């Protein structure tokens, strides 16, 4: 599962040259979410007399 | 040769299921019998002179 924002830092416009800041954001970070399974079980019996 | 009984116990009028306890019969059996043989001999010797 992905993450969102993502904050781009505005630049006052004194300079030219590129000369571009970018808020130093992680290019590819993701989150694993993992699932697990439980088991319900029962037993019954029948005696050889009833 | 076999031995005899070899009894089987009756249920305690409540213990019908499993619930083990039912007794058991004769675990060691088949008594051996050995026939030995005995030997004998006789002799009688005559002479010409009599």
Question: What topology does this entry show?
Answer:
The structure is cut from a larger assembly and holds 2 copies of chain A (50 residues).
Chain A: no helix or strand
Give me some keywords for this one.
part of a larger assembly, 2 chains, 50 residues, little secondary structure, 0% helix, 0% strand, rod-shaped
User: What integer value in Å does the Rg of chain A equal?
Assistant: 30 Å
Shape of chain A: rod-shaped
How far do the termini of chain A sit from each other? Answer: 57 Å
Question: What profile does the largest beta sheet of chain A have?
Answer: none
How many beta-strand runs of chain A?
0
| Helix content percent band of chain A | under 10%
Number of helices of chain A: 0
Assembly context of the chains: part of a larger assembly
* Coarse structural class of chain A: little secondary structure
- As a percent range, the share of strand residues of chain A is under 5%
Q: Summarize the largest interface: chains and residue counts.
A: A-B, 3 and 3 residues
Explain the overall architecture:
The structure is cut from a larger assembly and holds 2 copies of chain A (50 residues). Chain A is mostly loops. In chain A, 0% of the residues lie in helices and 0% in strands. Chain A is rod-shaped and about 95 Å long. At the A-B interface, loops of A face loops of B.
Task: State the gist of this model.
Chain A is largely without helices or strands and 50 residues long.
């Amino acid at each position: 599962v992905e993450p969102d924002a993502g904050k781009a830092t505005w630049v006052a416009a004194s300079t030219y040259g590129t000369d571009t800041t970018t808020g130093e954001e992680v290019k590819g970070a993701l989150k694993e979410i993992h699932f697990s399974t439980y088991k319900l079980a029962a037993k019954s019996f029948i005696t050889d007399e009833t």
